[PDB]
């Protein structure tokens, strides 16, 4: 533990200094070897001395003195657009005072405490001290000085000399404490002239010395961790943050609620660490707290008390109590001074002294008037004026090290973090390699004949994609490291630009590894050009493409806030770049309005360069000559011709350059220019990213138990947790249940309520009115959890109504349920905000209101036996806890039985209970009986059995814990379990229990046949209510439906209008097929957006709803599945209307007069695809825990399905191994149905550049020579008035459709199969959620 710089800390510092000076070897009070030397002076002087002092001014102590300070300040998505319009009008074109006049002076080396109720303005005061005025303004008359400086100077020049970090202790979870402190140590070491001392050794010595000072020595080489990741103790992370802040040379530190959610034994340690920092390093700490112990308060020096923004006192912490006693108020006995000061601002509390009632302030104005009139204010004003006079009488870059070394240290820390967790790099590299292998398997050993042309094209396009999107995952790191960077920017350690540059540099090894592992496999598995120079140029182009894409992704991520928030707008841009690469829409077929996009497309140039590199100067053997078949067996090669874009009549080989110049319109003069253009793009995007990251940042039954014994199996060893604990509860009596940390009071509470999934009961017996527990027990009790888990959308009344409907008995009419909900709302004093959205804890209902809501939710179910409460008064201030205790007292008065577990209470709250049950270590009962008034009964019981008397001003809870021996540093005279066993009152307890069992057993039972039911409401009602609740929650989500609609509409519109009124030439059909292929890309983004709103529902259900037996698991999963169907259907209809019609696919149905069937079928297919997207996302999220893993798995499976969907390679070309994956795939049937419906039964008109020239035999006509082939296979011909024939190979679209294995007569069948797949998905979900999460 930590006891604040004791002898052992001094000797540790002595040893460290001895080792350091011995290492450096290779007056009397500074030499470690000599005696008469103490570590205090060494630590104080190490920062200043032992380092060359820059000529500039860098203060070593800041005391702040301010006078006349004052600060003032100023939905359903259907209404979201109107709200946005109103906000825009507000942007286009009264004052509320939060802090009133106040005076204060704070010298260096004094720890100051700010006291006040929540919302009193302490946080605003601390923000004003730390110059964090953003969000409000300060009056012009206020005089603020920092040892003679000004707020502007501190904000501009000496930033980092005053800091502010309130609750969120942000650290890299996977970085060791030693490394985390060494980072700041090295980044704060000045350079000047380092001769004599090695900088690295000095930084290590500073890190070790400050670790020893704050008692973190044992924590070295241990993960700092986070609330999720395991690591150092929660009480040591705060000390690590203090050590880091003080190590970066922060003079004035301000903390608020830093000790929130921490027990007294650790809040004391935190306060002690602050005190040592103040007294050794001479810093100025300010701390704002609500729950303070007397011992912790004894360490403070100056206290400032706030009352509704009015400063009522400021001075020595010891004199505040005397001053407010002179005021005329009375402090109740056994009340801590901090609690008294806080309660002095509560109208319910603060009972005046006798005789002082007539003259005593009652409102903040009177308090401030007296404070101003008091002589203490005069003395304070005199001191402040003297300080101002003294200050008046008496570095361009706030950072210390130069930019290059900031970048170097950022790179080093990035490498340390990567080595600490080799998950993202290794997984990314191996996933890339495996996906590359699988993809290349489709294009294995492309042939050298012209028949491979198309495939080669595809083989390049996808390559450009894989190198393009290889580094997409890297942006995730930016979101993990964003908070820390901001914090480190505030401390004035390194600019965010340095961090961005270091992040770019540190990922180069991973980019190199991925590029090698993917290209060296893909380029050679697919038989591209074998010339070494060609491969090297391909690798160079791919490397620069991935650089450009990585920088673009980083630039996008620099302004976003989440993966989904970045993906919603980024998907449209990425699709725009992908479609216009030059393969989906070759340049000759690009529309006029989109030709300009290709100019500014950084990926089109890469594709052009790669294709020019491959095809240029290459001769391909012909694979098919247009005149051929049984009719033509012996025809001179002169009359034939190859079926390629650049084919020349009578030539056996087609030239690659002609094909490129004719089909894609690329030339070899652009091979090298495009490399320069891509380098320019990379540099531009790097500059944009750096600029962005630099700038854009900112009850008749009685329940009892007898001889309960409970043991748990751990490490194959049986240890008893509860050893024969007996007790009872009664209506109208509150039974507090307390114990040490290891006493397992929570274990007893959970065991009594049957909420434990582990262990068995050995000897006990639980009885209700003398009868054994039946199956109706679990529904006849209420359980109020410590943590309040509620949906962020449903209002208070909606949540209460939902619980009432789904939990009360079915025979009760709806009107009675609503009446009882109103009664509960009235009884809890909740009427003020009965229609206020719960929302996140930050914005919405505060802690007290949330706790009241939870108690109401558990109450509306109408428990008949008991109401367990788990730590109701933990994590709340001293006033909210009192309010909750009063509410519990009222509930008990109304006729309820309560059994609550209390942790670290105060005397006043403790006085409000009727019975006490104390558990020693190991679950052994010490005392069990009424504690009387002011805990007199328990004190008398313990004293009369050989215990020291309780001090008059001691808190009974702490004294009890100490006498039992659980308190640290306390010795027990003898164990009290045994003395309690034979105490003359344990006999009374036994007699009472036996009498209750013998008498209450004769009371007639209330046999209700509906009670003995596992769930109160029938299954269909639960399913309907859960589905409606989820639908409403999605509707009210803050911009979740709008993101989905925008994404889908934008993608569909871009896809439709890129091929606007597409023609039906040979390349047109391929363009439309790839349009259908690219229609599916929004799948990944839709899944990513949808999953978190499933996570929220799952967490709420599992944490609270499931154990409470509100609705069955099947109801939950079925509701989640049915919730997304309506929104998906609507979005699919919108997408079809925005894609099918602009594409002009309806014209294809005009000749056959089948517009309506082919339109309805297409709409049904599109909606089915979207419903399938939702079902697949939910399935892949059913069994996994994190949303990221489910989204990644869904994307991987979707990509695998797309690879073998039949467009990239049909069944014949596909290797046999993968043939099964071409049949089990759910997208092949969808693609076939869509193509057959949209393209079948229409004519084909070949473009001018795709006609093939044929030279018929001498003395023959085009018809006479080509009719047999035309009959044998489709196509048509024209006369060119030059003796030749211009031939087109396709006359009707049915030929191409048959080539893709899509038939018009089978579309319906295909559609049906797809529906089956959706069905399967749903079924699997309803099964997997049972195997994985249901216990």
Ligand X SMILES: CCCCC/C=C/C/C=C/C/C=C/C/C=C/CCCC(=O)OC[C@H](COP(=O)(O)O[C@H]1[C@H](O)[C@H](O)[C@H](OP(=O)(O)O)[C@@H](OP(=O)(O)O)[C@@H]1O)OC(=O)CCCCCCCCCCCCCCCCC
Q: Residue 1217 and residue 1210: Cα distance in Å, rounded?
A: 13
Phi, psi of 1093 (to 5 degrees): -75, -10
User: Hey, how many other C-beta atoms are within 10 angstroms of the C-beta on 1290?
Assistant: 22
Q: Which is nearer to ligand X, 519 or 920 (CB)?
A: 519
Q: Residue 194 and residue 24: Cα distance in Å, rounded?
A: 13
Residues listed for the chain: 1335
Q: Which is nearer to ligand X, 672 or 1272 (CB)?
A: 672
Report the nearest approach of ligand X to the CB of residue 533 (Å): 2
Phi, psi of 31 (to 5 degrees): -80, 115
Report the nearest approach of ligand X to the CB of residue 501 (Å): 13
Reading phi first (left if > 0) and then psi (alpha if -120 to 50, else beta), residue 113 is in beta
Helix or strand (DSSP H, E) at 430: helix 424-442
Report the nearest approach of ligand X to the CB of residue 544 (Å): 7
DSSP per position, 952-1017: TTS-HHHHHHHHHT-STT---SS-HHHHHHTSSSHHHHHHHHHHHHHHHTTSPP---TTTS-SSSS
The residue number whose beta carbon is nearest to ligand X equals: 533
Q: Residue 63 and residue 52: Cα distance in Å, rounded?
A: 25
Longest dimension (CA), the chain: 135
Q: Residue 1309 and residue 317: Cα distance in Å, rounded?
A: 84
Q: Where are the alpha helices (DSSP H) in 288-333?
A: 294-297, 317-327
Report the nearest approach of ligand X to the CB of residue 686 (Å): 10
Phi, psi of 173 (to 5 degrees): -60, -35
User: Hey, how many other C-beta atoms are within 10 angstroms of the C-beta on 996?
Assistant: 18
Cα–Cα nearest to 972, from 986, 961, 957, 985: 961
Could you tell me which residues are annotated as the binding site?
Answer: 739-746
Which residues make up the interface to ligand X (CB under 6 A)?
A: 533-534, 536-537, 539-540, 543, 616-617, 668, 671
Report the nearest approach of ligand X to the CB of residue 657 (Å): 7
Q: Which is nearer to ligand X, 537 or 941 (CB)?
A: 537
Report the nearest approach of ligand X to the CB of residue 1282 (Å): 30
Q: Which is nearer to ligand X, 533 or 698 (CB)?
A: 533
Report the nearest approach of ligand X to the CB of residue 540 (Å): 4
Q: Residue 658 and residue 412: Cα distance in Å, rounded?
A: 52
Cα–Cα nearest to 1161, from 1292, 1312, 1295, 1045: 1312
- Kindly tell me the sign of the dihedral angle through the C-alpha atoms of 889, 891, 895, 896: negative
Contact present, 671 and 534 (Cβ < 8 Å): no
Q: Residue 859 and residue 855: Cα distance in Å, rounded?
A: 6
- Kindly tell me the sign of the dihedral angle through the C-alpha atoms of 829, 833, 835, 838: negative
Q: Which is nearer to ligand X, 13 or 611 (CB)?
A: 611
Q: Which is nearer to ligand X, 674 or 1293 (CB)?
A: 674
Report the nearest approach of ligand X to the CB of residue 111 (Å): 51
Cα–Cα nearest to 865, from 702, 1001, 727, 1004: 702
Phi, psi of 837 (to 5 degrees): -60, 135
Q: Which is nearer to ligand X, 529 or 797 (CB)?
A: 529
| 1292 DSSP 8-state letter | B
Report the nearest approach of ligand X to the CB of residue 671 (Å): 6
Place of tokens 């970066």: 248
Report the nearest approach of ligand X to the CB of residue 616 (Å): 5
Contact present, 925 and 737 (Cβ < 8 Å): no
Q: Residue 1054 and residue 1036: Cα distance in Å, rounded?
A: 28
Q: Residue 1295 and residue 89: Cα distance in Å, rounded?
A: 58
Q: Which is nearer to ligand X, 655 or 1033 (CB)?
A: 655
Q: Which is nearer to ligand X, 484 or 505 (CB)?
A: 505
Phi, psi of 836 (to 5 degrees): -105, 130
Q: Which is nearer to ligand X, 682 or 964 (CB)?
A: 682
**Gaps in the chain following residue numbers (C to N > 2.5 A):** 26, 74, 93, 394, 698
Q: Which is nearer to ligand X, 617 or 1038 (CB)?
A: 617
Q: Which is nearer to ligand X, 434 or 512 (CB)?
A: 512
| 79 DSSP 8-state letter | G
Q: Residue 472 and residue 478: Cα distance in Å, rounded?
A: 11
Report the nearest approach of ligand X to the CB of residue 408 (Å): 17
Report the nearest approach of ligand X to the CB of residue 471 (Å): 13
Place of tokens 């080595």: 419
Question: In sequence order, what E strands does 407-543 have?
Answer: none
Report the nearest approach of ligand X to the CB of residue 8 (Å): 52
Sheet of 302-307, strand order: 252-256, 284-288, 112-115, 302-307, 310-316
Could you tell me which residues are annotated as the binding site for ATP?
Answer: 739-746
**Element counts in the chain: helices (H) and strands (E):** 49, 27
Q: Residue 29 and residue 44: Cα distance in Å, rounded?
A: 12
Q: Which is nearer to ligand X, 70 or 616 (CB)?
A: 616
Cα–Cα nearest to 1249, from 818, 663, 479, 478: 663
Q: Which is nearer to ligand X, 617 or 1210 (CB)?
A: 617
Report the nearest approach of ligand X to the CB of residue 608 (Å): 13
Q: Which is nearer to ligand X, 553 or 820 (CB)?
A: 553
Report the nearest approach of ligand X to the CB of residue 419 (Å): 23
């Amino acid at each position: 533990e930590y006891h604040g710089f004791d002898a052992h800390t001094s000797e540790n510092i002595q040893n460290l200094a001895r080792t350091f000076t011995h290492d450096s070897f290779k007056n009397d009070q500074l030499n470690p070897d000599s005696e008469n030397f103490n570590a205090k002076f060494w630590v104080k002087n190490l920062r200043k001395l032992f380092e060359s002092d820059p000529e500039y001014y860098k203060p070593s102590k800041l005391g702040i003195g301010y006078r006349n300070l004052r600060a003032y300040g100023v939905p359903t998505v259907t209404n979201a657009l109107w709200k946005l319009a109103t906000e825009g009008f507000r942007h286009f074109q009264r004052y509320f005072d939060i802090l009133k006049s106040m005076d204060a002076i704070m010298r260096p080396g004094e720890l100051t405490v700010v006291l006040g109720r929540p919302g009193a303005g302490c946080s605003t005061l601390l923000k004003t001290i730390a110059v964090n005025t953003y969000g409000f303004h300060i009056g012009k008359e206020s005089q603020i000085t920092y040892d003679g400086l000004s707020p502007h100077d501190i904000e501009r020049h000496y930033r980092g000399d005053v800091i502010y970090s309130a609750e969120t202790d942000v650290h890299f979870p996977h970085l060791s404490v030693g490394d985390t402190l060494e980072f700041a140590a090295r980044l704060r070491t000045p350079q000047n002239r380092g001769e004599g001392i090695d900088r690295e050794t000095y930084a290590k010595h500073m890190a070790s010395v400050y670790m020893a000072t704050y008692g973190l020595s044992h924590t070295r080489n241990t993960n700092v961790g986070n609330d999720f990741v395991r690591g150092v103790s929660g009480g040591e992370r705060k000390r690590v943050s203090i050590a880091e802040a003080s190590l970066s040379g922060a003079n004035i530190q301000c903390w608020d609620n830093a000790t929130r959610g921490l027990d007294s034994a650790t809040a004391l340690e935190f306060i002690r660490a602050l005190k040592t920092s103040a007294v050794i390093l001479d810093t100025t700490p300010l701390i704002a707290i609500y729950q303070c112990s007397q011992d912790a308060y004894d360490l403070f020096d100056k206290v400032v008390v706030l009352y509704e923004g009015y400063q009522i006192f400021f001075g020595k912490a010891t004199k505040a109590k005397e001053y407010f006693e002179k005021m005329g108020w009375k402090c109740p006995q056994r009340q801590t001074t901090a609690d008294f000061l806080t309660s002095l601002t509560n109208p319910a509390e603060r009972e005046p002294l006798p005789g002082y009632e007539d003259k005593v302030p009652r409102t903040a104005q009177e308090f401030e008037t007296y404070w101003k009139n008091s002589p203490e204010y005069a003395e304070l004003t005199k001191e402040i004026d003297e300080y101002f006079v003294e200050c008046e009488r008496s570095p361009a870059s706030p950072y210390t090290v130069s930019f290059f070394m900031q970048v170097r240290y950022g790179v080093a820390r990035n490498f340390l973090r990567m080595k600490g967790d080799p998950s993202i790099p290794i997984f990314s590299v191996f996933g890339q390699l495996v996906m590359g292998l699988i993809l290349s398997s489709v294009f294995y050993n492309l042939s050298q004949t012209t028949g491979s042309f198309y495939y080669r094209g595809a083989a390049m396009f996808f390559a450009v994609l894989f190198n393009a999107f290889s580094s997409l995952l890297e942006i995730m790191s930016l979101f993990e490291a964003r908070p820390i960077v901001e914090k480190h920017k505030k401390y004035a350690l390194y600019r965010p630009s340095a961090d961005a540059l270091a992040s770019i540099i540190s990922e180069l090894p991973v980019k190199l590894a991925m590029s090698m592992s993917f290209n060296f496999v893909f380029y050679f598995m697919v038989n591209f050009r074998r010339n070494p120079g060609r491969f090297f140029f391909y690798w160079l182009m791919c490397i620069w493409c991935t650089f450009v894409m990585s920088h673009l992704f980083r630039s996008i991520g620099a302004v976003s806030t989440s993966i989904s928030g970045a993906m919603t707008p980024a998907t449209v841009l990425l699709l725009a770049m992908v479609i216009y690469t030059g393969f989906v829409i070759p340049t000759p077929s690009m529309l006029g309005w989109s030709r300009w996009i290709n100019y500014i497309n950084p990926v089109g140039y890469v594709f052009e360069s790669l294709m020019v590199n491959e095809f240029h100067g290459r001769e391909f053997q012909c694979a098919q000559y247009v005149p051929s078949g049984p009719g033509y067996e012996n025809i001179s090669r002169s009359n034939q011709v190859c079926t390629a874009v650049g084919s020349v009549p009578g030539n056996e080989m087609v030239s690659g350059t002609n094909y490129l110049a004719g089909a894609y319109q690329y030339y070899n003069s652009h091979k090298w220019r495009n490399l320069g253009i891509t380098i320019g793009f990379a540099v531009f995007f790097l500059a944009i990213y750096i600029a962005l990251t630099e700038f854009n940042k900112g009850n008749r039954e009685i329940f009892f138990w007898r001889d309960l014994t409970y043991q748990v199996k751990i490490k194959k060893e049986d240890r008893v947790i509860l050893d024969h604990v007996d007790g009872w509860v009664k209506p109208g009596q509150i039974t507090a249940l307390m114990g040490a940390s290891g006493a397992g009071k929570t274990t007893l509470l959970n065991c009594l309520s049957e909420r434990v999934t582990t262990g068995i009961i050995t000897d006990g017996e639980r009885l209700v009115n003398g009868h054994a527990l039946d199956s109706s027990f679990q529904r006849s009790i209420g359980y109020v959890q410590q943590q309040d888990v509620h949906l962020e959308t449903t209002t208070v009344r909606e949540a209460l109504q939902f619980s009432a409907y789904l939990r009360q008995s079915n025979k009760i009419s709806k009107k009675e349920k609503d009446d009882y909900v109103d009664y509960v709302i009235d009884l809890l004093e909740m009427t003020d905000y009965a229609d206020a959205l719960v929302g996140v804890a930050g914005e919405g209902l505060n802690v007290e209101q949330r706790k009241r809501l939870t108690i109401g939710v558990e109450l509306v179910a109408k428990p008949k036996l008991l109401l367990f409460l788990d730590e109701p008064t933990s994590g709340l201030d001293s006033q909210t806890a009192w309010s909750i205790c009063k509410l519990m007292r009222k509930l008990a008065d109304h006729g309820q039985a309560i059994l609550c577990t209390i942790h670290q209470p105060s005397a006043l709250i403790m006085a409000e209970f009727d019975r006490l049950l104390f558990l020693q270590k190991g679950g052994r009962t010490a005392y069990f009986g009424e504690l009387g008034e002011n805990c007199q009964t328990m004190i008398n019981y313990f004293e009369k059995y050989g215990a020291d008397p309780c001090p008059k001003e001691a808190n009974p809870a702490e004294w009890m814990l100490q006498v039992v021996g659980a308190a640290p540093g306390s010795h027990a005279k003898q164990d009290y379990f045994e003395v309690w066993r034979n105490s003359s009152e344990y006999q009374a307890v036994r007699e009472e229990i036996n009498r209750m069992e013998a008498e209450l057993s004769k009371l007639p039972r209330d046999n209700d046949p509906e009670a003995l039911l596992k769930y109160a409401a029938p299954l269909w009602k639960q399913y309907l209510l859960v589905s409606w609740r989820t639908i409403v929650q999605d509707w009210r989500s803050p911009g979740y439906i709008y993101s989905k609609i925008f994404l889908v509409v934008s993608a569909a519109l871009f896809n439709g209008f890129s091929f606007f009124k597409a023609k039906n030439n040979m390349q047109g059909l391929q363009n439309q097929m790839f349009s259908v292929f690219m229609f599916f890309i929004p799948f990944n983004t839709l899944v990513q957006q949808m999953l978190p709103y499933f996570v929220k529902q799952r967490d709420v259900y599992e944490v609270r709803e499931a154990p409470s037996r509100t609705f069955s698991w099947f109801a939950f999963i079925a509701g989640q599945i049915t919730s997304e169907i309506p929104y998906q259907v609507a979005v699919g209809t919108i997408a079809f209307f925005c894609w099918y019609y602009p594409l002009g696919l309806y014209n294809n149905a005009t000749p056959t007069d089948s517009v309506n069937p082919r339109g309805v079928l297409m709409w049904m297919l599109v909606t089915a695809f979207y419903v399938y997207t939702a079902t697949m996302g939910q399935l892949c999220m059913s069994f996994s825990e994190l949303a990221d893993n489910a989204a990644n798995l869904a994307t991987l499976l979707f990509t695998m399905c797309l690879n073998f969907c039949g467009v990239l390679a049909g069944p014949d070309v596909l290797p046999g191994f993968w043939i099964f994956m071409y049949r089990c795939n759910p997208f092949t049937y969808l693609v076939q149905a869509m193509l057959s419906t949209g393209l079948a039964n229409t004519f084909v008109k070949c473009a001018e550049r795709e006609y093939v020239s044929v030279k018929p035999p001498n003395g023959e006509s085009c018809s006479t020579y080509l009719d047999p082939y035309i009959k044998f296979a489709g196509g048509y011909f024209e006369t060119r008035n030059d003796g030749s024939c211009a031939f087109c190979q396709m006359s009707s679209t049915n030929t191409f459709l048959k080539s893709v294995n899509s038939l018009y007569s089978e579309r319906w069948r295909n559609f049906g199969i797809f529906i089956a797949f959706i069905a399967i998905n749903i079924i699997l979900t309803v099964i997997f959620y049972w195997l994985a999460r249901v216990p």
